[PDB]
Amino acid sequence: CNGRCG
Amino acid sequence: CNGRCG
Amino acid sequence: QSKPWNRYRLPTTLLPDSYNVTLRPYLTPNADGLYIFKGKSIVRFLCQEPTDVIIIHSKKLNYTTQGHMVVLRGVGDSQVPEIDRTELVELTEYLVVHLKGSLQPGHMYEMESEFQGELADDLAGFYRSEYMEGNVKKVLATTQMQSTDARKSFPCFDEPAMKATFNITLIHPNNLTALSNMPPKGSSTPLAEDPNWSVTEFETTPVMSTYLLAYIVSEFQSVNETAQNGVLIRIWARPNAIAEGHGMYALNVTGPILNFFANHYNTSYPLPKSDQIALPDFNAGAMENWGLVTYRENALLFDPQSSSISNKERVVTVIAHELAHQWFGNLVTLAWWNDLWLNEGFASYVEYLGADHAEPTWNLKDLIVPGDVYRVMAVDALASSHPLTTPAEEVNTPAQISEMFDSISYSKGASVIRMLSNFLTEDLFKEGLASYLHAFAYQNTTYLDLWEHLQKAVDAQTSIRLPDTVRAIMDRWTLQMGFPVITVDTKTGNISQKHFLLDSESNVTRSSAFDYLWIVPISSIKNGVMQDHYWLRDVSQAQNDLFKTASDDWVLLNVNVTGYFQVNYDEDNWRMIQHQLQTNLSVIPVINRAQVIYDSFNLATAHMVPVTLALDNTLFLNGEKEYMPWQAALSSLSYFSLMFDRSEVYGPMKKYLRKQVEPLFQHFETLTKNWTERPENLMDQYSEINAISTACSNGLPQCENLAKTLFDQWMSDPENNPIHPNLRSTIYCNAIAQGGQDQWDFAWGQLQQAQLVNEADKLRSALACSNEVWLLNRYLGYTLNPDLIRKQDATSTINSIASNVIGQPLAWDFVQSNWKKLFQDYGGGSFSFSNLIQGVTRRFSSEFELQQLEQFKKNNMDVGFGSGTRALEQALEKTKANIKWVKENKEVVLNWFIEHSS
Amino acid sequence: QSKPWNRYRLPTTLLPDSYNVTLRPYLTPNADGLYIFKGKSIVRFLCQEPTDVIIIHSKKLNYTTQGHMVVLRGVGDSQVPEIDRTELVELTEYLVVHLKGSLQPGHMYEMESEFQGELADDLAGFYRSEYMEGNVKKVLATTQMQSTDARKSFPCFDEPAMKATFNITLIHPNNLTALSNMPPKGSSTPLAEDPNWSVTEFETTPVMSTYLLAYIVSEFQSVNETAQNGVLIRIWARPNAIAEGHGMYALNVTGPILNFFANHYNTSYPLPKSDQIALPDFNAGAMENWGLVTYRENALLFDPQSSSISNKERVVTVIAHELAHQWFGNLVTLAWWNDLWLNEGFASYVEYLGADHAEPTWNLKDLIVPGDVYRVMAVDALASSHPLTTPAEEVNTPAQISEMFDSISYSKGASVIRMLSNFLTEDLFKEGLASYLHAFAYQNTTYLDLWEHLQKAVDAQTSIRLPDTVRAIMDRWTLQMGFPVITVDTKTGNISQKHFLLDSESNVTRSSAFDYLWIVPISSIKNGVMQDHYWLRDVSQAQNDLFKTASDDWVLLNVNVTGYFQVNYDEDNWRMIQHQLQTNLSVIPVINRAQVIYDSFNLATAHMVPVTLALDNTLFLNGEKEYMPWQAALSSLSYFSLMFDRSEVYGPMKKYLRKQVEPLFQHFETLTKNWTERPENLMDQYSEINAISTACSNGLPQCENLAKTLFDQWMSDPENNPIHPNLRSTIYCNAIAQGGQDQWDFAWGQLQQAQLVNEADKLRSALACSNEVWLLNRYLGYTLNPDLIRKQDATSTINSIASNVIGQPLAWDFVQSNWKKLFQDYGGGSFSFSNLIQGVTRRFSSEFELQQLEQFKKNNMDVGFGSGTRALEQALEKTKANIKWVKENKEVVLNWFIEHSS
Ligand SMILES: *[C@@H]1O[C@H](CO)[C@@H](O[C@@H]2O[C@H](CO)[C@@H](O)[C@H](O)[C@H]2NC(C)=O)[C@H](O)[C@H]1NC(C)=O
Ligand SMILES: *[C@@H]1O[C@H](CO)[C@@H](O[C@@H]2O[C@H](CO)[C@@H](O)[C@H](O)[C@H]2NC(C)=O)[C@H](O)[C@H]1NC(C)=O
Ligand SMILES: *[C@@H]1O[C@H](CO)[C@@H](O[C@@H]2O[C@H](CO)[C@@H](O)[C@H](O)[C@H]2NC(C)=O)[C@H](O)[C@H]1NC(C)=O
Ligand SMILES: *[C@@H]1O[C@H](CO)[C@@H](O[C@@H]2O[C@H](CO)[C@@H](O)[C@H](O)[C@H]2NC(C)=O)[C@H](O)[C@H]1NC(C)=O
Ligand SMILES: *[C@@H]1O[C@H](CO)[C@@H](O[C@@H]2O[C@H](CO)[C@@H](O)[C@H](O)[C@H]2NC(C)=O)[C@H](O)[C@H]1NC(C)=O
Ligand SMILES: *[C@@H]1O[C@H](CO)[C@@H](O[C@@H]2O[C@H](CO)[C@@H](O)[C@H](O)[C@H]2NC(C)=O)[C@H](O)[C@H]1NC(C)=O
Ligand SMILES: *[C@@H]1O[C@H](CO)[C@@H](O[C@@H]2O[C@H](CO)[C@@H](O)[C@H](O)[C@H]2NC(C)=O)[C@H](O)[C@H]1NC(C)=O
Ligand SMILES: *[C@@H]1O[C@H](CO)[C@@H](O[C@@H]2O[C@H](CO)[C@@H](O)[C@H](O)[C@H]2NC(C)=O)[C@H](O)[C@H]1NC(C)=O
Ligand SMILES: [Zn+2]
Ligand SMILES: [Zn+2]
């Protein structure tokens, strides 16, 4: 993931 | 008196 | 059974005949910086009733008399009792001479004393004033006796009815000039014990009151004129002020004003000369000392080059006011301070008449309406007001006496006297006025004496008929507070009166002997034609066909607002007046064009008309060229701007005002030949000032253009200010707002070198118009620096910054943050926290801002709030009233401006 | 002894071989508005060790399987034990199948289930997304498995090392398109039970991780290309987006990026096709699902007409990043989440290389320095930082896994990998990279495996020599947090290292096995000539003649900031670099011109140089034309503006920045042919954007002129926007600031009809630039209205208003006042009180403002502060640090700007 990831 | 009087 | 020296009023057992008084100020302090004056006096008095005690006033005087504090002698071959002891009673400000036997009725006595007091910088009694002449600090000695300070300069029977003649002598440095009420008897002579001093003796005064004495030692110089009757007229000021020509306007108007009053009063000017003197920083404004009137400099002096026209208006009116008293107040003196309103109210009315004589093209008389009538109506339409009259026995202490000098006494005094002259007619009023002055010359009176003399003139003619006696009519206007709203239903001609209060939820608890009913003189105009005069009797309701209209007819009451009341109509008659104003405004006198605005906004406040009806009354202004109606709108709307200038209401409000003012701006643009020459008379100059101020502050591009061009032009040639003084406050402010640190720093440099107070004031005010946060905060940081901002200008400057919508939170934060400049500003100056608090909190109109103010107050625990302690309670209650008003009015007002801004 | 189903890690006793999965989203909700999906799966797994329990992940799935929750079969002729019971254990997210006997090693089993879950709008697992096509609300079904959400769509061994093949089938409405990792096997066929539905089967995936699966049902359309090798490339989006051409840039760059990576990795793209899809509002940004990469729309789509160049840069870099993973991360997968930094850090570095290939004139590789290096150094120079590596046994729960995805992992990951490639050389790095991918294809690794493969390449050549093993070197950069400042005394050539912290009073309590010493690769340039490379060993101090200078000689370390460290020098060598920059700046690489600025302001913060030395390093900018050094100055000075823009420091600060930027403004004015044509490459366009922004915001009259002219021109012809997208944010903002309600209302109308998010964002931001208090308050009033301002834009808009120096107190008052929009904004959306608090309190730097913030916090008693609870504690501590910094720096900084603004 890229950006706001979890 | 005229203005600020007492 | 109380001892007479513990009573505030003097006994009537002894009355003064004449005084010798010699005063010697020491203008060089001693080693510890104490300045003193020394004096010697002899009072001659007559015994009316036997008494073994002499009670005379004395305040802050140390006695150095040989023996007891006085020496007592009999006049002629009268024996005198021995003195038992002398004592000073501080509370009641007496020197008390207890005798070993009684004085005898019909006998005269002389009482001699020697004394000294501080020549303090306290503006009271004989006091010092310090000012700069270049490198040098100058110190002069001068007086302010009004009300109860003659006794601070020498022992005297210091009540206004206890009149006497006075022989004044001044001992002073030989290179200074000595002045008093009367001319000097001749050349000064050397003081034999030290010829560095000289002695100046003055001619004996007429019989006069102690509160009107004056004497002054200074380096001042004069410009002069000898009137045709031989009266010498002089204007005195600092040598440099005189040499700059600043005394000339005062000199110009003084002769004509004195001539007008001699004629108006049918009585010759009662003295051989007239001196008027400009004192630096005289905090009282002006004082009518008989033959030697004192003024704050900036009130008497006038610099044509840098002064505005309103500035000029102030000079001539202040002079007319003081000169008025040289007969009314000084020749005939009210017996006691409870009747102060008659003396000050009369002068406050006739100042306009004297000034009009000196400047007959200016139409000055009209200015009493916005200046005094509507001004005082704002405070007289409160439950907390008070009647003009006060029972004499309730006015005893110096503090109680000082409370007589308020807005009600001066401005309502003027308003009701003007009303009285009008319903009498001036000619008839002047006849009773003359009769009164002639009967009571050099004596004392009460207001009832004037009414009696006016009644005599009424009774001696057949033309003017009244519904009751002068006294019964005036009693309604003097014994109860407030004034009525007169309400007309033009469908029926029914007319009603009731006590007008701005706050419709107010409880009035002061009772009236008349149940708040008045006897009311009512002029009226119907379709632009004067109707017969009408009197409303002491009834709630009446009917007359004068006030009944046909559907296409309009009627309007209180021509020129000569009557002390406001008027409401049914909505139909309002709409008709509106149509008239829109279609041919000239049919309605200019003062009534203003009245319609003034009255309707007050009526809206009191919930007697909708706020939109008041607003509707401004719609005609797009075609209005004259000063007063525009002034009415601007005064009535400043609160709207205060409440709404941070809200969505402001866009449409400014848009509406731009639309209304543009045609006026355009008019002056052409009339003034592209702003190169001012309109001719005063009212039109005032209209132009307001038009420019209104245009610029509401964002009219053409006004902004003018301001930037003029300020740019000034900055490129600093020694040649291209901006006429009338326009400076706007042009400076708007150009600073539009610009940045270049304009700001330039204006700051101009401020720092300004030599003239008025120009410095405009710069200080204009510097607060910047729209840069950082410049406003930097400016705030300067306010507490005496090297940059005089302490006496500190709070005023902060308030100017607060007035800026952007400066509002900066000032408020600054004030809260620096509040602990109270533990450095109550005992070392006053500051005026009161005015500061009011100014910075003036805008508050939300529950949120109310909560903040409460939380600020919670620095209670210590520090308190000194002289504005409750100027803080007032702020809480005012904010609540603002919250409530904004809540009831926001929607309606928003939509009205939107609806009317095109 | 703990039961395995209460442990967060799966047993190793069973390993999956392959899965069949059929999913059926129901895009029409039931009566109560519940959306569901149904599914059926079969997992085939192998027994490695005997066990009588099967533990597999399952989250938020309801089972409708006949019998127990699963059916269990033997593969081939394997017997299977009977099921005892099945249970779900929510905490550890398991489905647990208890057996009556043991599975046998070497045997394979098939486990079948039928299930359903909510197709929630929660962006997790198989979920729904709603968007508008005109009048109509559309709903699609899509996936986000990363990290632990595959188990929310079907039961699976949901750990990244437990790889398997997947045969996916989608059952969907027959007029929609179904996509997954692999191509469809053929045409869709009707669902026999209801032919309104169709069935799309996909080819078997390669062996892969569950977190990389994807499947999507929508109305989307594509633009496509077939690469030369037969790989089908498609960009998918909303039909209207495709028809407007918004997919074209993505399509343009995708082929070149895939080609670059196949070559870079020495490995063919491992799939038959590449799909990339633009999803409306996909909150995660982008996700690298293997063969079907998902993006937020505005990140993949590009509108040339209205998009800025920075916008274009984002598209190509985000694509390069995701495509990078199609080998690194997806073909070779890190065994566990504790090594996430290697996967994300690697992609975060090589995104610049892939993008550079697609846009070779843009010099994109340089952007990692301001974008990642200095960005992450800000948080890695804190005591509260953490090492890149984390022991695997400390990362167990889904929350612990989520914490791996932070700035350190991505940006420090990128920075240290870039460093490693550089000191290896790219050629050598690529050789070990290839060796690693080839050895571990379709398997799992740890970071030690990459180091071993890089070591193999080092050991196979003789040119590049290291002071230790790759692992020992990288251990210094991965096992301990932070980075060193390298300090050089050029008089002696002495060089030192120590752990760099911004706060010099910080106590570091995290221990390091290396005592915060690193092994550091140090490039250097002397008088503009490259010197031999140097390694600082694990010593505090060393000496080398490389770093020893002659009095007229200068030296500069870390060329192009390839090393993860900052550099300080003695003052003499600083002054020499300064002279060079002033006299011929071109001698120093552009990235190092920026470094000198970046580093010195950080060193000043940490008290290692005076703040005036950092400021001195900006003096050269008047002759600087390139983007990066100006960006360094602007980033390093935004705090100065934040702290000082309300103070007396601001005038001289703005004056200084005007002086510095004017020659650049002038340069572009000529270069751009009076602003009619943009510079050619990216860096120069970026320089122009910054120059205009800087000129306008600091009050350069020529910039203000340009902004007013352009906005005036736009207002007179609204459909033909004359302002290039690169310049809009400045031009809009400055023109609105200069104007009034005409510009504001016009921009508001433009905002209300904007169709494109990016244009709407610029307008929203620019509307906050008004200098009218009333417009800012009216705007604030709009922020809470979903009809005017989307809730998701509310806090951001308030923050824009707060950014305005005039809007600061308005926003702060608004926030305090409306704080009780928390009892309407935690359970109905997030809002982000955290970001709001930070934004509105960012300026606070006085004891007075600190007291206010404390008093606000005292609405504690109830209401609290939800998700920004401590975003409030942080605000208190930040304000204290601000108070302290302003106190130590105010005087010095004031005098420096005064001194240097002419
Ligand atoms: C009037 O007399 C009083 C008292 O004799 C003087 O005030 C005193 O001055 C002395 C010496 O300067 C100080 O110790 C005290 O502060 C004062 N004493 C009292 C009792 O107040 C005062 O200065 C005299 N005034 C004049 C004008 O001569
Ligand atoms: C005092 O009165 C004189 C005489 O009326 C005014 O003198 C005129 O001043 C104006 C303005 O500079 C000149 O246009 C005239 O030449 C003057 N007239 C005469 C007869 O000298 C003078 O302006 C008055 N002073 C003030 C301050 O109003
Ligand atoms: C006071 O007013 C009286 C009364 O009006 C003035 O005396 C009149 O003066 C005019 C002037 O020529 C004469 O024609 C009248 O016959 C006078 N009337 C009487 C009764 O004498 C008088 O001039 C005024 N006095 C002052 C000092 O102003
Ligand atoms: C206060 O004023 C009254 C006048 O209103 C003075 O009384 C008059 O005195 C004169 C001349 O001295 C007598 O001829 C009158 O008969 C008096 N008129 C009266 C008593 O009504 C009174 O003397 C003044 N009071 C003082 C203290 O001077
Ligand atoms: C999964 O099963 C649960 C429980 O059977 C369902 O949730 C229940 O729904 C009923 C009726 O809508 C409500 O009374 C309750 O709020 C829920 N019960 C419990 C125990 O939570 C749920 O909707 C099912 N999900 C799917 C996708 O079918
Ligand atoms: C995708 O690539 C094409 C082909 O290189 C670019 O096409 C050019 O577009 C520009 C700008 O309108 C025109 O000057 C050219 O005529 C086009 N060239 C060709 C060969 O058609 C296109 O701009 C790219 N799309 C984007 C968004 O960058
Ligand atoms: C993987 O890299 C290898 C090794 O460099 C490449 O093979 C070389 O390719 C060139 C191209 O002509 C030949 O000249 C060399 O002789 C090759 N070397 C060997 C050992 O075969 C190979 O092309 C790369 N493969 C991929 C898929 O990128
Ligand atoms: C995780 O990855 C490792 C490789 O790093 C896998 O182990 C290898 O398996 C292959 C082929 O299946 C064998 O030929 C090698 O001998 C193994 N290498 C080893 C053990 O180091 C391992 O199977 C993967 N784990 C899972 C659960 O698939
Ligand atoms: Zn990634
Ligand atoms: Zn007066």
What does this structure look like?
It is classed as hydrolase/protein binding. The entry lists the keywords zinc-aminopeptidase, HYDROLASE-PROTEIN BINDING complex. It forms a tetrameric assembly. The entry is titled "Crystal structure of porcine aminopeptidase N complexed with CNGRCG tumor-homing peptide". The complex is a heterotetramer, with two copies of chain A (6 residues) and two copies of chain C (902 residues). Chain A is mostly loops and 6 residues long. Helix content of chain A is 0%, strand content 0%. Chain C folds into four domains: 1-220, Immunoglobulin-like (Sandwich), CATH 2.60.40.1730; 221-482, Neutral Protease, domain 2; 483-569, Immunoglobulin-like, CATH 2.60.40; 570-902, Alpha Horseshoe (Zincin-like fold). Chain C has 27 helices and 31 strands. Chain C is α+β, with helices and mostly antiparallel strands and 902 residues long. In chain C, a hairpin with a 4-residue loop joins strand 19 (286-287) and strand 20 (292-296). The radius of gyration of chain C is 29 Å and the shape is globular. Helices cover 39% and strands 19% of the residues of chain C. Chains in contact: A-D, B-C, C-D. Bound molecules: a molecule of 2 linked components (NAG-NAG) (8 copies) and zinc ion (2 copies). The site of a molecule of 2 linked components (NAG-NAG) has 3 residues of chain D, from loops.
